[PDB]
């Protein structure tokens with residue numbers, strides 16, 4: 313199963329992707345997570361990406377395409393994969409098309425998780441992330457069993473650096489500009505499937521499961 317999840321900041325790509333990987337065992341590849349892991353490990357990649365990430369701007373296509381090409385070439389991906397947050401520009405989509413021919417693994421679906429732009433700020437300012445595994449919670453919409461710690465591993469939950477109001481505004485602006493072009497690109501390819509992500513997590517996942525159940 314070759315999948316791509318797309319959506320505006322805070323729409324719920326990670327929340328739905330974790331559910332997909334637990335049902336299908338494919339690797340969950342999020343470029344955002346890769347960038348934050350790089351920053352945490354203080355690598356050259358982390359240094360390069362941090363500037364854009366802190367501003368809520370897109371990390372340049374070249375370096376981003378490069379780490380995805382490398383990542384998809386790993387053995388854990390020979391049985392399928394779940395891209396999350398990549399591609400997010402038409403240029404990245406065209407590049408992904410080329411890359412997948414190489415690794416002989418064309419896209420089955422590009423799932424677009426649609427949530428009103430006006431309710432995303434609340435999704436992000438109320439978000440808490442696990443410092444250990446990266447899973448996310450929400451103070452109101454999906455709270456951890458115990459405040460301050462992850463259900464799975466007890467790690468401390470914190471607020472992602474770019475989830476501040478100022479940065480979210482830039483993130484929304486930047487990605488909204490990229491949204492129609494990406495939808496048009498995949499609609500034409502026929503890989504696109506829009507899902508209403510502004511409902512309970514389970515209702516959203518049910519619709520997603522429906523789609524994936526159609527693939528061999």
Ligand SMILES: Nc1ncnc2c1ncn2[C@@H]1O[C@H](COP(=O)(O)OP(=O)(O)OP(=O)(O)OP(=O)(O)OP(=O)(O)OC[C@H]2O[C@@H](n3cnc4c(N)ncnc43)[C@H](O)[C@@H]2O)[C@@H](O)[C@H]1O
Nearest residue numbers: 321322323324325326327343344365371397439449450453
């Ligand atoms: N390809 C690329 N090219 C260039 N630059 C790139 C790049 N990829 C990454 N970058 C750089 O990296 C930065 C960060 O990228 P990235 O980490 O990919 O940012 P993002 O796309 O904005 O997505 P988010 O992680 O913020 O949200 P999400 O959709 O996963 O939502 P979640 O499930 O956590 O949910 C959010 C909250 O909502 C809650 N929630 C989830 N579902 C629901 C629901 N159904 N109902 C109510 N609440 C819900 C959750 O509990 C949580 O609190 C970018 O800004 C850019 O600088």
Ligand SMILES: [Mg+2]
Nearest residue numbers: 325326342344
């Ligand atoms: Mg995410």
Ligand SMILES: [Zn+2]
Nearest residue numbers: 442445462465
């Ligand atoms: Zn955790």
